[PDB]
């Protein structure tokens, strides 16, 4: 008997119903209250400047034409019946290629309460666009927006809201961080207005504040570049008659800095300016360049060929350009590191 | 109210034929197009294309969809566009495209009381390019988006850019990671064939590549490696192990730069402006070690049968020749 009344309510919902027109098309605006539960803030790609997110995307609005009377207080609808009812055309303003899941059944749930308050949940995967300012790579931080709104309906037709307080409306799961290179610090929920060519739309907005871990870049890039520049200065403490030795030392530390330069760029997207790491490598490349030019100046003023035997003819003095570069070049590299790690750990 | 609006929408499609063009025996219908560009995702030099996301919008006036009494513009559901006449406009440059379908398909139908109808689409298209990369990376590009009707000639359909030069908006908001949009142009023209003239709209952008990246990674170390090859001219000819270890390791460091920029840079397999410079700098490094064998053979081989004059010559000529090489290079491509 209860199953007969249930099927009679389902058969008589959509009689005289028109899904082509908004509820209250000449009466009032449609307040669709939205709600997002984030299950996985997925892989952020720096190359494509994008990110992936899995959401449970809840919507709630009132349709007066779907009121009913019966024993139950809430209905559950088939996908065939949910596709015959008006549903707001929410799209993501910065979505690149997003997926509505349907394994094994379509992950949509449309519920009708006794006063016609529709509730509509969807499980979505949204690959959205995150523009980045890579001026301080890798010691940078940026906010990835997730912005959605109605496509066809203006402010005077469909208005979006949140189902709770705005900061409490987007809930990221406690297991839902899923980042290997970034640290999800927190979210910021706001709301805005576009002026398109068609008219004013209400744009819900959730920002996602990310900070890059720099522990990988110190060990892979910074510390071998520092230790190679330390080496190129360490060749100043050799004797000046080691003309093959300081030559072999000089050119190969340039080749070692060349190998460190190309590998660090490969694990980075193709920006058209100087990142913070690009400055550090180029300046550290200049010290290793200046070390071999320094030995060329030492070699020009040598005046002898043989080295000092340990028991003692005349011998070479330790050159003044060597003794000064022992003090000058470790100091200038030490000053530059104090400038570098105070400028880019401040922004 | 609301029942009168429902009655109006039901009688607009009462007897509507979706196969009839507006003014089917009369004048050609004028379709005005309006593009709001969301982003340009990537500009690929290997695949010779670019990805373009935009809000492609079409306006035309259908007399069968005119209504009176209702003072508001009827914004309908997107699934009524399967019940209307829409123009058969496609893209000539189109490699791959799709209308976004999450959470629903991003169409819009907004009827106006005089019969004007808006059909908007959020389209992510991949449009082809013919890129001239002979001056890479010091070049300006020109990629376009050609819009054309598929079936109807100019006797039946006409195109125009709505608002003239302010049709395509959102170009100044585009920040490409390696290009810079100099100027976009809007061309409207009929393409005359033997059958009849077909309407065509053209949207194009100029892409000047930013060169600050290539100065740092590519040009600057190849200059500094060439200067280190000249260090063997202020070293005596007696120091054989010193002057060889300069020049031999310097041709290897040029090799590791040339080989790993072949792997890092995009794979365009013809001669570019960066390949001519890197091969040119490899010659100066190669000539700087031919200089020492010229020195070493004259003293130690042609000795028992000047040597410092060769080094004194090379200290002036090879910086002068490499500065002359940079003069010819940076005036021919810039």
């Amino acid at each position: 008997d209860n199953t007969t009344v249930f099927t009679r309510i389902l058969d008589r919902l959509l009689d005289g119903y028109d899904n082509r027109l908004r509820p209250g098309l000449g009466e009032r605006v449609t307040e669709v209250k939205t709600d997002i539960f984030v299950t996985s803030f997925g892989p952020v790609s720096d190359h494509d400047m994008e990110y992936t997110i899995d959401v449970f995307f809840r919507q709630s609005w009132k349709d007066e034409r779907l009121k009913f009377k019966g024993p139950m207080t809430v209905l559950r609808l088939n996908n065939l019946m949910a596709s015959k009812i008006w549903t707001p055309d929410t799209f993501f303003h910065n979505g690149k290629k997003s997926v509505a899941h349907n394994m094994t059944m379509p992950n949509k749930l449309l519920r009708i309460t006794e006063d016609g308050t529709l509730l509509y949940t969807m499980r979505l995967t949204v690959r959205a666009e995150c523009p980045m300012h890579l001026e301080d790579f890798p010691m940078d931080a940026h906010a990835c927006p997730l912005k959605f709104g109605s496509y066809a309906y203006t402010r005077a037709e469909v208005v979006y809201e949140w189902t709770r307080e705005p900061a409490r409306s987007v809930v990221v799961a406690e297991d839902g961080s899923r980042l290997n290179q970034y640290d999800l610090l927190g979210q910021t929920v706001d709301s805005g207005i576009v002026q398109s060519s068609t008219g004013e739309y209400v744009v819900m907005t959730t920002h996602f504040h990310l900070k890059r871990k720099i522990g990988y870049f110190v060990i892979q890039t910074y510390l071998p570049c520092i230790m190679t520049v330390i080496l190129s200065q360490v060749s100043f403490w050799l004797n000046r008659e080691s003309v093959p030795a300081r030559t072999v030392f000089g050119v190969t530390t340039v080749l070692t800095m060349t190998t460190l330069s190309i590998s660090a760029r490969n694990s980075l997207p193709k920006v058209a300016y100087a990142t913070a790491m690009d400055w550090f490598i180029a300046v550290c490349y200049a010290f290793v360049f200046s070390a071999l030019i320094e030995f060329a100046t030492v070699n020009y003023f040598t005046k002898r060929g043989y080295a000092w035997d340990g028991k003692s003819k005349t011998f070479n003095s330790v050159s003044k350009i060597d003794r000064l570069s022992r003090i000058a070049f470790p100091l200038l590299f030490g000053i530059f590191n104090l400038v570098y790690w105070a400028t880019y750990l401040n922004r | 109210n609301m029942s009168f609006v429902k009655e109006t929408v039901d009688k607009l499609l009462k007897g509507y034929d979706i196969r009839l063009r507006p003014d089917f025996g009369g004048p050609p219908v004028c379709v005005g197009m309006n593009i709001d560009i969301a982003s340009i995702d990537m500009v690929s030099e290997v695949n010779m294309d670019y990805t373009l996301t935009m809000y492609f919008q079409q306006y035309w006036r259908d007399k069968r969809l005119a209504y009176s009494g209702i003072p508001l513009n009827l914004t309908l559901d997107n699934r009524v566009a399967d019940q209307l006449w829409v123009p058969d406009t496609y893209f000539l440059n189109d490699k791959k495209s799709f209308v976004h379908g999450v959470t629903v398909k991003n169409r819009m139908i907004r009827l106006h009381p005089d019969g004007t109808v808006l059909y908007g689409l959020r389209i992510t298209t991949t449009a082809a390019c013919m890129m001239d990369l002979r001056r890479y990376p010091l070049d300006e590009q020109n990629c376009t988006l050609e819009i054309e009707s598929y079936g109807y000639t100019t006797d039946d359909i006409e195109f125009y850019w709505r608002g003239g030069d302010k049709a395509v908006t959102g170009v100044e908001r585009i920040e490409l990671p390696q290009f810079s949009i100099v100027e976009h142009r809007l061309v409207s023209r009929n393409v005359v064939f033997a059958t009849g003239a077909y309407p065509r709209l053209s949207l194009s952008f100029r892409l000047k590549r930013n060169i600050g990246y290539f100065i740092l990674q590519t040009y600057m170390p190849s200059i500094l490696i060439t200067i280190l090859s000249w260090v063997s001219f202020w070293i005596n000819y007696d120091a054989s192990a010193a002057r060889v270890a300069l020049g031999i390791t310097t041709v290897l460091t040029m090799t590791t730069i040339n080989t790993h920029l072949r792997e890092t840079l995009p794979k365009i397999p013809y001669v570019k402006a960066i390949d001519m410079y890197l091969m040119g700098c490899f010659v100066f490094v190669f000539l700087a070690l031919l200089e020492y064998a010229f020195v070493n053979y004259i003293f130690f081989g042609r000795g028992p049968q000047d040597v410092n004059a060769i080094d004194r010559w090379s200290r002036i000529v090879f910086p002068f020749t490499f500065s002359l090489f940079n003069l010819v290079y940076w005036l021919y491509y810039v």
Partner: nanobody
Amino acid sequence: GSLRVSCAASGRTFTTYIMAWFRQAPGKEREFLAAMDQGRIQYYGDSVRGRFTISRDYAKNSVDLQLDGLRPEDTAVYYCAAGAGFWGLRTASSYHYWGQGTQVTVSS
């Protein structure tokens, strides 16, 4: 009366950046007035929503604030900010570039 306080930027293209407008009354509290993202999305403070209209010119690298319906409580200094808001769009410590200031006086 109405007003239109402008902000001409120089030295850096801020199209990617979020250019905003603040307000500092006597009381040392920089209040959010208006912001705009790269996608032309207008964010307004709740006390100033519907009155002040923000617009950015992405070609000439500028942001404009259209003052409208000026109550006498609007007598303050208007700061043109420009940042990439991090914990931001409402926090003053997320915008890393600042204007000089404009002493707007609304008498009655």
